[PDB]
Amino acid sequence: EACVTSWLWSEGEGAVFYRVDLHFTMYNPCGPEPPAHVVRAYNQPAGDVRGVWGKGERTYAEQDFRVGGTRWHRLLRMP
Amino acid sequence: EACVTSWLWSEGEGAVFYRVDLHFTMYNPCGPEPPAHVVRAYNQPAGDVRGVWGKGERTYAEQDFRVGGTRWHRLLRMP
Numbered sequence: 001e002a003c004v005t006s007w008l009w010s011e012g013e014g015a016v017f018y019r020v021d022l023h024f025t026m027y028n029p030c031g032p033e034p035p036a037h038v039v040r041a042y043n044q045p046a047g048d049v050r051g052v053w054g055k056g057e058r059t060y061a062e063q064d065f066r067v068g069g070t071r072w073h074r075l076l077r078m079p
Numbered sequence: 080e081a082c083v084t085s086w087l088w089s090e091g092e093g094a095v096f097y098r099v100d101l102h103f104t105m106y107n108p109c110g111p112e113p114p115a116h117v118v119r120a121y122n123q124p125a126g127d128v129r130g131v132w133g134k135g136e137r138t139y140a141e142q143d144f145r146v147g148g149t150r151w152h153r154l155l156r157m158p
Contacts, residue, residue: 003110004118021109022101024117029137030100031082036158038103039083043155045142047126058108063124076122079115 001025004077006060008042011071018042041072051075080104083156085139087121090150097121120151130154 001024008018018038033039044067051062053075061078064071080103087097097117112118123146130141132154140157143150 002113003108004112005109006122018103020101020103022099022121024097024099024113029082030084033083034081034103039156040158042101043085043140043157045124045126045128047124049124061122077118078122079119 006074006076008038008072008074010041011073041067041070042074046074052078085153085155087117087151087153089120090152120146120149121153125153131157 003021003023005019005021008020010016016035016038020042044065046063046065048065049061049063052059053062054060059078060075062073062075064073066072082100082102084098084100087099089095095114095117099121123144125142125144127144128140128142131138132141133139138157139154141152141154143152145151
Protein backbone atom coordinates (compact mmCIF):
# COMPACT_ATOMS: atom_id res chain seq x y z
CA GLU A 1 0.00 0.00 0.00
CA ALA A 2 1.48 3.33 -1.13
CA CYS A 3 1.19 6.57 -3.07
CA VAL A 4 2.08 8.90 -5.91
CA THR A 5 0.73 12.26 -7.13
CA SER A 6 0.12 14.59 -10.08
CA TRP A 7 -1.23 18.10 -10.73
CA LEU A 8 -4.11 19.42 -12.86
CA TRP A 9 -4.81 23.05 -13.79
CA SER A 10 -6.90 24.88 -16.39
CA GLU A 11 -6.48 27.97 -18.56
CA GLY A 12 -8.73 30.98 -19.10
CA GLU A 13 -10.17 33.16 -16.35
CA GLY A 14 -12.14 31.22 -13.75
CA ALA A 15 -9.44 28.55 -13.81
CA VAL A 16 -9.18 25.84 -11.17
CA PHE A 17 -5.94 24.41 -9.80
CA TYR A 18 -5.54 20.82 -8.66
CA ARG A 19 -3.04 18.98 -6.50
CA VAL A 20 -4.11 15.37 -6.87
CA ASP A 21 -2.73 12.41 -4.94
CA LEU A 22 -3.31 8.82 -5.98
CA HIS A 23 -3.32 6.00 -3.46
CA PHE A 24 -2.75 2.44 -4.55
CA THR A 25 -3.72 1.15 -1.11
CA MET A 26 -16.19 -5.86 -3.54
CA TYR A 27 -19.04 -3.42 -3.00
CA ASN A 28 -18.94 0.43 -2.72
CA PRO A 29 -16.76 3.32 -4.00
CA CYS A 30 -14.45 5.26 -1.61
CA GLY A 31 -16.32 8.51 -0.94
CA PRO A 32 -18.02 11.52 -2.59
CA GLU A 33 -17.66 13.08 -6.04
CA PRO A 34 -16.05 16.55 -6.38
CA PRO A 35 -17.16 18.74 -9.30
CA ALA A 36 -17.68 16.07 -11.99
CA HIS A 37 -16.03 18.27 -14.58
CA VAL A 38 -12.73 17.88 -12.77
CA VAL A 39 -13.12 14.13 -13.04
CA ARG A 40 -13.98 14.15 -16.76
CA ALA A 41 -10.71 16.03 -17.31
CA TYR A 42 -8.10 14.10 -15.34
CA ASN A 43 -9.20 10.80 -16.87
CA GLN A 44 -9.53 11.84 -20.52
CA PRO A 45 -6.77 10.17 -22.58
CA ALA A 46 -4.68 13.16 -23.63
CA GLY A 47 -2.80 11.03 -26.17
CA ASP A 48 -0.75 14.07 -27.13
CA VAL A 49 2.24 14.88 -24.93
CA ARG A 50 4.50 17.90 -25.43
CA GLY A 51 6.30 18.13 -22.08
CA VAL A 52 8.83 16.26 -19.93
CA TRP A 53 9.78 18.13 -16.74
CA GLY A 54 10.71 17.66 -13.07
CA LYS A 55 14.02 16.48 -11.63
CA GLY A 56 14.71 12.77 -11.85
CA GLU A 57 14.67 10.74 -9.58
CA ARG A 58 11.14 12.04 -10.28
CA THR A 59 9.90 12.51 -13.84
CA TYR A 60 6.67 14.23 -14.90
CA ALA A 61 5.07 14.37 -18.34
CA GLU A 62 3.20 17.55 -19.32
CA GLN A 63 0.16 17.34 -21.63
CA ASP A 64 -2.30 20.05 -22.75
CA PHE A 65 -5.81 19.27 -24.05
CA ARG A 66 -9.18 20.87 -24.86
CA VAL A 67 -12.33 19.26 -23.46
CA GLY A 68 -15.67 20.70 -24.52
CA GLY A 69 -14.52 24.30 -24.37
CA THR A 70 -11.87 24.53 -21.65
CA ARG A 71 -8.12 24.04 -22.10
CA TRP A 72 -6.39 22.12 -19.32
CA HIS A 73 -2.94 20.85 -18.44
CA ARG A 74 -1.91 17.64 -16.67
CA LEU A 75 1.51 16.55 -15.40
CA LEU A 76 1.82 12.90 -14.38
CA ARG A 77 4.68 10.70 -13.04
CA MET A 78 6.46 8.91 -15.74
CA PRO A 79 9.50 6.80 -14.74
CA GLU B 80 -11.90 17.76 -0.48
CA ALA B 81 -13.20 14.48 -1.93
CA CYS B 82 -12.64 11.32 -3.93
CA VAL B 83 -13.12 9.10 -6.95
CA THR B 84 -11.61 5.78 -8.10
CA SER B 85 -10.59 3.56 -11.03
CA TRP B 86 -9.15 0.08 -11.62
CA LEU B 87 -6.00 -1.17 -13.39
CA TRP B 88 -5.18 -4.76 -14.35
CA SER B 89 -2.75 -6.50 -16.70
CA GLU B 90 -2.85 -9.51 -19.02
CA GLY B 91 -0.55 -12.50 -19.36
CA GLU B 92 0.51 -14.78 -16.52
CA GLY B 93 2.10 -12.94 -13.60
CA ALA B 94 -0.57 -10.27 -13.93
CA VAL B 95 -1.20 -7.67 -11.25
CA PHE B 96 -4.60 -6.28 -10.29
CA TYR B 97 -5.16 -2.73 -9.08
CA ARG B 98 -7.94 -0.97 -7.22
CA VAL B 99 -6.84 2.65 -7.29
CA ASP B 100 -8.48 5.54 -5.47
CA LEU B 101 -7.77 9.16 -6.28
CA HIS B 102 -8.12 11.88 -3.68
CA PHE B 103 -8.54 15.48 -4.70
CA THR B 104 -8.05 16.64 -1.12
CA MET B 105 4.61 23.71 -1.54
CA TYR B 106 7.36 21.24 -0.71
CA ASN B 107 7.24 17.38 -0.59
CA PRO B 108 5.27 14.55 -2.27
CA CYS B 109 2.66 12.53 -0.30
CA GLY B 110 4.42 9.25 0.51
CA PRO B 111 6.34 6.30 -1.01
CA GLU B 112 6.46 4.87 -4.53
CA PRO B 113 4.92 1.42 -5.22
CA PRO B 114 6.42 -0.66 -8.04
CA ALA B 115 7.30 2.11 -10.53
CA HIS B 116 6.03 0.01 -13.40
CA VAL B 117 2.51 0.34 -12.05
CA VAL B 118 2.92 4.10 -12.12
CA ARG B 119 4.29 4.22 -15.69
CA ALA B 120 1.13 2.37 -16.75
CA TYR B 121 -1.73 4.22 -15.08
CA ASN B 122 -0.44 7.58 -16.32
CA GLN B 123 0.39 6.68 -19.93
CA PRO B 124 -2.06 8.43 -22.29
CA ALA B 125 -3.98 5.49 -23.73
CA GLY B 126 -5.50 7.72 -26.42
CA ASP B 127 -7.39 4.72 -27.76
CA VAL B 128 -10.66 3.84 -26.03
CA ARG B 129 -12.81 0.85 -26.95
CA GLY B 130 -15.06 0.49 -23.89
CA VAL B 131 -17.86 2.29 -22.03
CA TRP B 132 -19.24 0.30 -19.08
CA GLY B 133 -20.66 0.64 -15.56
CA LYS B 134 -24.14 1.77 -14.54
CA GLY B 135 -24.81 5.49 -14.71
CA GLU B 136 -25.08 7.43 -12.38
CA ARG B 137 -21.49 6.15 -12.65
CA THR B 138 -19.77 5.81 -16.02
CA TYR B 139 -16.42 4.12 -16.68
CA ALA B 140 -14.36 4.11 -19.88
CA GLU B 141 -12.37 0.96 -20.71
CA GLN B 142 -9.04 1.25 -22.57
CA ASP B 143 -6.44 -1.42 -23.45
CA PHE B 144 -2.79 -0.60 -24.22
CA ARG B 145 0.66 -2.18 -24.62
CA VAL B 146 3.59 -0.64 -22.74
CA GLY B 147 7.05 -2.04 -23.38
CA GLY B 148 5.90 -5.64 -23.53
CA THR B 149 2.90 -5.97 -21.21
CA ARG B 150 -0.75 -5.45 -22.15
CA TRP B 151 -2.85 -3.63 -19.56
CA HIS B 152 -6.40 -2.39 -19.12
CA ARG B 153 -7.67 0.75 -17.39
CA LEU B 154 -11.23 1.81 -16.56
CA LEU B 155 -11.69 5.42 -15.45
CA ARG B 156 -14.72 7.58 -14.43
CA MET B 157 -16.11 9.47 -17.28
CA PRO B 158 -19.27 11.55 -16.63
